[PDB]
Amino acid sequence: QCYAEITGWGKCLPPATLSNHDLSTFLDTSDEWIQSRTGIEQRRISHVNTSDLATVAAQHAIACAGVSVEEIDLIIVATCSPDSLIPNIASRVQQNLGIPSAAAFDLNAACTGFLYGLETATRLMQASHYRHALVIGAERLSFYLDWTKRDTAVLFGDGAGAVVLSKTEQKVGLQDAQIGCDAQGRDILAVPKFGTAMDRFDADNGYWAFDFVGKEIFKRAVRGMGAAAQQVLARSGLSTEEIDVVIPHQANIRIIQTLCDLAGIAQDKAFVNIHRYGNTSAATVPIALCEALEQGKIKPHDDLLVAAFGAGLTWGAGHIRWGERITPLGKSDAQLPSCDHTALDLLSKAIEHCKRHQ
């Protein structure tokens, strides 16, 4: 029996920052409304491609683990906003980092993608030969947004987080996990007309609908994550009291609080950074984990609960038993190209196109 220890962690948040007030300047919204409704105060807008964010997050996680690029056997990029479909962007990260030979694939399960990736990488390592893995959640959701639609325009942001996993006989890393999908709810959270369902040659094909039935999403999210968490707890033989830290998906602070409140888990155990970054889909969990660790919120041998949900409606929970080390073995000086533009400058063109089309 073996396990996939999380030996490295890393993050990449692009610099350009879009505040709630910024949004209020071109949208019929308010900082009060956004902040009280969602807990979000800021989010980041990338001046680079998704794969670029993924790459920097990877470099930091690799440095953190002290592993050689030559030792990585598997690369998973959880994203729903890839630079390209042919080829995948896992291979771009691989090319960028000089990793030879490794299996490289993109995994799309929306905001639950990092948890799906962690589960997949862990089980691949447990049942076969993979010695080390890189699992990255990375998104440029700003690509998708309709800047005239306040319901969705204020929720999402860009970023990446990564882990490195290493095979071990110690009982650490992801233990039990339950991942799933409530497909009867597929239509409540969707951009159905970006992908091969779109009309390639229609000049209005950029003006797609972003379906977001907020209340039903909230209900189904709390239900799905909560039930998944119950299953993992029950199978683990841990009480709710023995969970040391919750690292939740960051969609809405009220969902986080409800999940905790209903699971009987103390609210202060939940790591929250949604106020800084908004909902970065697949990146939420690995960014939160990285920052939890950076901030000393996780101690060695802690039991962590992870939970997430997203379009699908995909959902998941997992139990991670931490090992001995919560500090990086080294640091990377990797960075994004400098950006000379505010978020508002970066979005300028898109905001004008969306507004012009109404």
Place this chain on the structure above:
Amino acid sequence: QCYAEITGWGKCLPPATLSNHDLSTFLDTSDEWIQSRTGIEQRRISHVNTSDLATVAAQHAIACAGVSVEEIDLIIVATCSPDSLIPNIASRVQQNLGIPSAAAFDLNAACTGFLYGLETATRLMQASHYRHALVIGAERLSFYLDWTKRDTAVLFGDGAGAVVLSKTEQKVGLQDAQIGCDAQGRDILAVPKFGTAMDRFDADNGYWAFDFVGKEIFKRAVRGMGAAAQQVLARSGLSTEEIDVVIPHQANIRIIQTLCDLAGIAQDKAFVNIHRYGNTSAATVPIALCEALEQGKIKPHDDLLVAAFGAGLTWGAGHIRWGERITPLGKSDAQLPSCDHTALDLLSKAIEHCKRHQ
């Protein structure tokens, strides 16, 4: 120790057929050129979305396995041509089939995606609780093609294949597998400007380049698949003589023959249907497997070699040990909506747009 038996197989080929002569009518090519160069004589053009093809292939595989939709714990759709990115199309297949609860994700490793999916599903089942899985390779590559570019326009086609896997203690299904990616070659096979790297609001964004460096692809494919096959053979403790059947990716008949010739495997062991369908990327392997089985080419307890390669440059090989049953337990009458148009009629609009833009 447990295993993931292939208990169900199924396929969906759309009806509209584009012959080599059809292509010659709007392209500076010939049936002689295509046929002698690639082995391709026909390919299918879908009148429906990728997810629709995936769904029919799934229904047949489910019927073949005699498993209940209630028993499926995992759904993987290997594709690089999804209807949509938000949400994934695995969840659409799930919704369509009424499968409750199952994990559902899209996996993108280009034409190696089905092998990546089979490996992933198998290891998930071996190391965790998943009882049954659906793994589907499905593509509408016709979405991507530039109908003025003869190098690529003649190679690719649409379709889907699926398997159902079931957990067992018998030593059957996927045994050893080696999957990988030669990222130094990422740029030789690419559509870099469909995805979030594209300019959403540029009215010429449909006219993307399809990079295809044919000779270097051929070289790197033969090398990668051949080395992967060597590793699986070596680790299995089987001689090349003990491989009963090869189910290869269908990119080019010369690649198939070279792979076999260089591996010392008799050419007549390789199942080939490229002449009918061309290169359907992730669907090639599962369609070939399904048809091999339909045609009685696989016997119980046979040792199968699978091999594939694609954009990335992803690559893989696997050894499948067949179990007892090579006939379906039942049949599905599922079908695509009727199509009243020839392939040429379906492509009409796209061909005119591409030609008009030169």
